[PDB]
């Protein structure tokens, strides 16, 4: 009649956490199968509250976040609210990393129930001096826009004079990701601000709105000149990557003789300075297009 | 052991629990959960579930239907309201028989919090009065106050 | 996003792991991606093969190729130096190369591919700081001394008024 998930058990009380890793990687082999049958969620459940091991937790998560959650039992086990609440401690820490952690984990996360007053606990944690966390914020953030954006809905322009609070590059080139995402509007407003200020400017961030800008104008424009001000900062042009978009861009927006001339140009350097051949194939193909 | 506080946490009944553990007090929202601290005295160490005895989580504690080992119950001393109906689950408890695997208190808290009953008017209210196949020595707190409490739960190990 | 998986391969047929950044489907989609890449499609060399407006980005090193996969455009170099710095990273992630020291540090790899890469975003440089960052952090032990003792203070105190009471 008995059982080896039995056979886990004791294991896991003989190591302690170094047991349980052990049965954490043959229950992931289980449960990447798909595979289990219940009950270690009983000891997992009443071990753990009451225990560290941040590593297992770390697997264990994961494990979670992976695997189900709106499982059979529920939705939740039934518990993925009391539970939470350390979590949401953990998640509230003063602890930075191990919050930015759980946020990275967050971002995966989508559990409702105990979102919500998390909703409260992770406007807390923006304000932490820690970029790491934060960032975390604008991924998870953007979990919740498709999830239940509503579930914020103030969120667009918080951002944005968020924004306005910052100044690290990382996490502004990911504002601007998700920015646009809700509304590019607010971009905007703050691209008329930046023009200028752009060349001065990292890279990636600047990327992103070469994105943007191309969709709204097959539907409809009118709007050049503020852009075009920039623009022409813009054909200064001078990364790798940056050359990269920026004869493309132009393309995109533009063929007049004197267009086709400009980028002609700077794909033919380029390709004279280039060097992966994979690389240069693929100018062709535009080319090919062109 | 397992110790059980239960009521609904959130009024400082979870304050009660704080106070304990750190010294501190409810700076938590008002908790429904498992709130966990181990307290090691004999060397058994308490695992304390200070558990709201809201809705869900009153209704729902099945996997923590398993044996116990210590009671606390953390009282309103101003509840005086709940206690009649609780009366009528505790009976539930009492039908349960992991639910007769502890020698214990009740605690009443919250005493400067408006006022308390009479230690016997409490007793037979809860339905406390009719025990014995557990003790049943009878230990108020307060939730600012609480002392010889000790003695309640001296007897009470040692059961 | 630039990424929707991430997938470290040996020769096999069977890319030794992968992580999934977003669920949905089933493996078929990865599964049938991992069909594909052990039959290479018997083509004979190139460490890169896009078709079908599917990168397909490789790396061999080795009898392992490392596998990203994209789409829709990108700049090159930057995404060559992540190949090769997946090249750079293992002996110290997983330790050296054989399925199986990664086998035991999947869990690290896993971490590495999320750390080291938000969505497609190059994060950082050095992986001893990259180690850092969590599993290896700093704060909590501050905030744990002083307040785990504080709170022992109130303990251990309260272990002479449980003494006698």
Known sequence: ?290 | MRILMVGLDGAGKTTVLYKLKLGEVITTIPTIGFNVETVQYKNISFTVWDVGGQDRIRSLWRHYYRNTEGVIFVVDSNDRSRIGEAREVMQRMLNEDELRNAAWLVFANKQDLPEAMSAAEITEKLGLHSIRNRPWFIQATCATSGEGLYEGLEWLSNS | MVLLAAAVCTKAGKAIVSRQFVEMTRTRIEGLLAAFPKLMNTGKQHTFVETESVRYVYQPMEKLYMVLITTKNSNILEDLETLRLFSRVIPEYCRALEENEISEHCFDLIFAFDEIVALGYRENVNLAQIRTFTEMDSHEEKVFRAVRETQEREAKAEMRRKAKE
């Open chain 1, 1 to 290: 009649e008995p059982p080896s998930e039995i056979s886990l058990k004791n294991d896991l009380e003989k190591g302690d956490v170094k047991s349980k890793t052990e049965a954490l990687k043959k229950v992931i082999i289980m449960i990447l199968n798909g595979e289990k049958l219940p009950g270690l969620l009983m000891t997992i459940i009443r071990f753990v509250l009451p225990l560290q091991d941040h590593t297992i937790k770390k697997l264990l998560l994961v494990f979670w976040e992976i695997v189900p959650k709106t499982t059979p039992d529920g939705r939740l086990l039934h518990e993925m609210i009391l539970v939470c609440d350390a979590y949401r401690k953990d998640l509230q820490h003063p602890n930075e990393f191990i919050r930015g952690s759980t946020l990275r984990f967050l971002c995966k996360l989508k559990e409702a129930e105990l979102l919500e007053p998390l909703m409260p606990a992770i406007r807390a944690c923006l304000e932490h001096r820690h970029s790491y966390v934060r960032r975390n914020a604008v991924l998870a953030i953007y979990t919740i826009y498709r999830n239940f954006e509503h579930l914020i809905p103030d969120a667009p322009e918080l951002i944005h004079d968020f924004l306005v609070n910052e100044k690290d590059a990382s996490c502004k080139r990911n504002a601007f990701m998700m920015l646009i995402h809700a509304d590019q509007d607010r971009a905007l407003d703050y691209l008329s601000t930046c023009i200028d200020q752009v060349q001065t400017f990292g890279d990636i961030l600047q990327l992103v709105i070469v994105e943007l800008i191309y969709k709204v104008c097959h539907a409809n424009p009118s709007e050049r000149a503020r852009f075009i001000r920039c623009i022409y900062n813009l054909l200064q042009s001078s990364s790798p990557a940056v050359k990269y978009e920026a004869a493309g861009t132009l393309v995109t927006l533009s063929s007049a003789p004197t267009a086709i001339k400009a980028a002609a140009q700077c794909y033919i350097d380029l390709i004279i300075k280039e060097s992966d051949n994979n690389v240069k194939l693929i100018v062709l193909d535009r080319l090919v297009e062109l």
